[PDB]
Amino acid sequence: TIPPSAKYGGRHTVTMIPGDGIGPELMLHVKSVFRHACVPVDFEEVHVSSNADEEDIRNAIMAIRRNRVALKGNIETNLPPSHKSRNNILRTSLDLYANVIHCKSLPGVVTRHKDIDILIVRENTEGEYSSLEHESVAGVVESLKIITKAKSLRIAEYAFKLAQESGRKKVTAVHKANIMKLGDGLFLQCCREVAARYPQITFENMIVDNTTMQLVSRPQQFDVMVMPNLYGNIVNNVCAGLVGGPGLVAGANYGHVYAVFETATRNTGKSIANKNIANPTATLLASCMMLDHLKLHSYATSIRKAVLASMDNENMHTPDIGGQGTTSEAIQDVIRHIRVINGRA
Amino acid sequence: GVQTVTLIPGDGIGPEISAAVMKIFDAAKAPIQWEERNVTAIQKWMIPSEAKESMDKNKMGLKGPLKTHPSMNLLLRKTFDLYANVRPCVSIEGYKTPYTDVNIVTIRENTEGEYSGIEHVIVDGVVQSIKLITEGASKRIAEFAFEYARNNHRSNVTAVHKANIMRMSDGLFLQKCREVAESCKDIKFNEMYLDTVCLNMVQDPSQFDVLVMPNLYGDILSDLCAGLIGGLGVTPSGNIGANGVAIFESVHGTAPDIAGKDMANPTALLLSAVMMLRHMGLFDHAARIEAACFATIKDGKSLTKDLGGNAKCSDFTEEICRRVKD
Amino acid sequence: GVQTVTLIPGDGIGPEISAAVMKIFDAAKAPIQWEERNVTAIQGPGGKWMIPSEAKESMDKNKMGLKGPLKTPIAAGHPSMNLLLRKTFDLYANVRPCVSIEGYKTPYTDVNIVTIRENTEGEYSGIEHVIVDGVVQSIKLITEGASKRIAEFAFEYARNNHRSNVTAVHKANIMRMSDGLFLQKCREVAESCKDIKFNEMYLDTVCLNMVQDPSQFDVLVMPNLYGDILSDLCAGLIGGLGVTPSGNIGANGVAIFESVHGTAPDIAGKDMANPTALLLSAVMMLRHMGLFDHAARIEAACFATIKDGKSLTKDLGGNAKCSDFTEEICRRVKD
Amino acid sequence: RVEGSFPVTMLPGDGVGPELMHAVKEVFKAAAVPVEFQEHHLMASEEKLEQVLSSMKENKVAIIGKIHTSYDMRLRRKLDLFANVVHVKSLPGYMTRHNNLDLVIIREQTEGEYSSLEHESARGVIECLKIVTRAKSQRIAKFAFDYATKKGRGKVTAVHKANIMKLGDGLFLQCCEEVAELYPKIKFETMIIDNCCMQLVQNPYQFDVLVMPNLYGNIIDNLAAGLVGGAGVVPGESYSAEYAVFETGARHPFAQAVGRNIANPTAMLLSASNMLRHLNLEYHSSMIADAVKKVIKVGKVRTSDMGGYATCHDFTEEICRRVKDLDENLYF
């Protein structure tokens, strides 16, 4: 068995990978809101950006073993070999098997659709991350991907457990089982094999081609969605678009003992790095999920309620959602809406 | 003189909307005779040679629904080498969807990727998909997309890809896309991640011109656009191919719910064919058969089940047919 | 034509044996200039290792390079030098012959067979990986291109080296697609040269019969899926891996003729290391530079140095030294 | 002592098989053995394959003659025959280049070559997809060591190509070394397949038991069976969880053996005697052998391939004579 989480004296220690792009600055800010909210949390900053060696990412992975929770900015890749992807090596080698993404539409941020509120549980360990590619003969590139029964169960097990725990009703399995009959079919049955164990939660399925079409027209029709690690990221990205952009949606890779919280987008925003126009709500909401994971709900609620308040100000909207304010002002707001007295609310 | 063109109405509302186009197509006064056929499976599994014969000479085509051992569509890609899958999503002038000014063309590889796949169980509880992507099929679908861009007066061509995950396959499809684009500097060529395309698309689809993509993720990007304009009912199609053939089609399914019932919308098959004129060279009858239909809807006089109202396969059809003579 | 032929030192036993060949090549003073080199894996800039670039030249000027042993590349999980040399010069064929040494007593007395193994891909394009805990999967491939190419070569080696008939060796039951293709490319080259009888046998069928009566074969052509199994099996028939020669023929006429020893430094430097290989490995290399008369002499002196029965090496049922052997040949090349 | 007779399913097979079966029958009648054969032969409607299985579930032993001809393969799958054993042991009268050899070759035969989905990527590009797992390496490693102890063998040599197969053959030898702990009475060693083939020709006397994965097994069976005397003297057997089929040892003896009454039956009679020792009819197993091993030493009767000119029909018929009360076996 494994050593305990690094919480001694009411304070947890969590790893912080600041990452590339605007990752550094937004992470700093999180600290600023964290220190101001009087949250029992300290940040063991770990560097993960040097390229071509696993000296870098072997280190963060060990860190996360030590403390059992981390918060990351977004590593950028563009060594340049076929290789593997540093961000996914975490996900795969910590067995963070359950990317989740919450997509409530914001009330401040008005877009084409209103009233959205989706949950997007997604397989996070095989399929795409399983790919093996080789150039057998010049001009011929073959790619082998694996979808198993084990990992397809637990994400379906997780999708319902979460859907019950959250008091949601529908669950939709997204797949393209028609075109690839054997493999997506395997997945789909395993959802059925669980949707029986939870009869009160409506179960369903949908072809992914259709899902993307129903998403961009009448997307209010989805509660939970559970889908293999496939289809690129159309489903996680169409909704990120719908609710207002990548600067708002914030996701989380849970595992059995581990967890890593991050922006739902994989962007680094190297275009606007060190320019104080980077939107902080996504990252801030991330860390709110990280607080609920450490069971510090009170502080999660407080910061979150404040993160949504700031978003009601059209003045506090950053350039990605059409405004003209800055990260710094934005962060000022959210700090103005957490009022703590003797460390409370 | 006239123009002879194979044709295969299908299942469901298929033969109904099909001949409902013959009605409106001839009601335009349009030069085309329809050497009809019917494809089904015979066994080495091949389709009927009555069609296969005719269209080698008839060259073009038109199509409708089907159903499903080797499925109907698969035998049409394979035997006619229909190696590209053009599909314009331009948004209707009357039909109100929140994405108003979409105008996108989504050329797509029709020969590799999933369509070369081989699911095969490795051990109990462990499926494994082999896909392959080749050089030649990429350079060929890459070349295609600039020809299309040049011909139909397009400005941008963006390769869509996901070399995050499939570094090697999409990295070679990108290699061959560039080679092509460095021979056609008239066209603005950029590459975008598949993630980012769906992020931008739903946010502001107006920045998108021609999109060329391998077939690894295939259909999903094209259908997402269709969601933007209003549905699969109004979405055209087309499968340019090697011999010189080019089967146009409608993308909706069998439609068994209201098979007869006079309840169907043909704007698919119509605009599938307004594309056929343009391939064939009849631009002048084109803009007629087209603008007659966008006004048919813009007015709002009638609207079938897909668009909502009460009109039938016949009520809408003749309602365009008379508008075309004007 | 006073030719230059590059000579890799050979690590471990290589020094004793390489210079043993040189000194025995002094005895008949063949027109050979020994442009020494070495191919210790070096790491190339773009990422993947590259060879020493004076060798990549010395052998791209001169065309025959005679190799020796290769220090086992166990230093780290990096490319094996043997793999570099074969890939660099694209040597697509490995030809190892097996003749019964008349001196050496071994149960199989009438053996004269040659095993041509296709050396492009197959086993040598090895991609093993993992699918779940304890479920490795291997991916090997056989290509029609280099199938015909070794089917071509192989008949050519019969005609060129005056060899009655040819046997393609395979497993067209177990793996019908991969070998049926490799057969097929041999069947087409059979019609081309119908002066050479062509049969097909199973890998199994061969092994069973060659161990009972090895006389019946003489050239065997076989893809790389099986590897040195069949060739190393014969080595035993004539007795020893140190009396059998090997040579990688390549495209553009380039070619490295080598021994197939190991790197056991135990008696290496004990002046007792049998060099009977690289010598016969070069007797091939002379025969590949038209030097038929300069090689048939080197050889029969080595065959009747062994048939001698006193000036042997300890690896072949004796007690003496590599120094006694090399010189007993040296006096017998002068007759 | 044996009321009735043990039922043994027999597929005679195509070619010189039935003729060899008939030899097993005649030497069995002569021998006074309580065994009853029942036979189902073997492509139109393969109902026979389940007709055979049913029998196989009832009897759970068999004798086969190698359907010359997925036929054979689908049968072994349905039975889950995972272990194959070839007994390479020189007969005493029958001299070869390697005499007084006693070896036993256990090869895996559920995976490896016997899976290997093969497909085409480009015109002229074929691809092989072999699978090695720990489930089935452990299984055959257990069998070998269990067998090695049951038969009193002192050494197991695991044959591998872990030089080139870094992982897969690596994986195999892990299970062998894991299993080798349980049996500390048994010397364990590994050997490379290229090296082992050469060692098998030079000093084959160095081995006891050889356990190897599938690729290399089909090859070493025949390579070994050559040392000992050829394809008609070497017997073998295959083992399911609950099943057992007995047969000839060398797999592809000849492209064509056409011509009646010339094939040597020593393989089946010795396989068949080994079959009896499975049915725990130990004394008849020890007398059908002793007769066959003693018609060989007498040298009078031999088959074309072993030396003489005597036919199948007369090489058989001299064995019965030797079983039929003309055997001593009084050493206890």
Residue numbers in the entry:
A (entry chain B): 5 to 82, 85 to 351
B (entry chain A): 3 to 45, 50 to 74, 80 to 337
C (entry chain C): 3 to 337
D (entry chain D): 10 to 51, 57 to 83, 93 to 355
Give verbatim excerpts from the published study on this entry.
Among a series of biochemical reactions in the TCA cycle, isocitrate dehydrogenases (IDHs) catalyze oxidative decarboxylation of isocitrate (ICT) into α-ketoglutarate (α-KG) using NAD or NADP as coenzyme. Human (Homo sapien) NADP-IDHs and NAD-IDH are also called HsIDH1, HsIDH2, and HsIDH3, respectively. It is well established that HsIDH3 exerts the catalytic function in the TCA cycle, whereas HsIDH1 and HsIDH2 play important roles in cellular defense against oxidative damage, removal of reactive oxygen species, and synthesis of fat and cholesterol. Mammalian NAD-IDH is composed of three types of subunits in the ratio of 2αː1βː1γ 22,23.
The crystal structure of the β-mutant HsIDH3 was solved at 3.47 Å resolution with each asymmetric unit containing one α2βγ heterotetramer. Thus, the heterotetramer has a distorted tetrahedron architecture with the two α subunits occupying two vertices on the same side and the β and γ subunits two vertices on the other side. Specifically, the two β and two γ subunits are arranged alternately to form the inner core, and the four α subunits are positioned on the periphery. In particular, residues 10–14 (AKYGG) of the γ subunit make several hydrogen-bonding interactions with residues of the back cleft of the β subunit, which form a major part of the heterotetramer–heterotetramer interface. Consequently, the αβ heterodimer assumes an open overall conformation similar to that of the αMgγ structure rather than the compact conformation of the αCaβ structure.
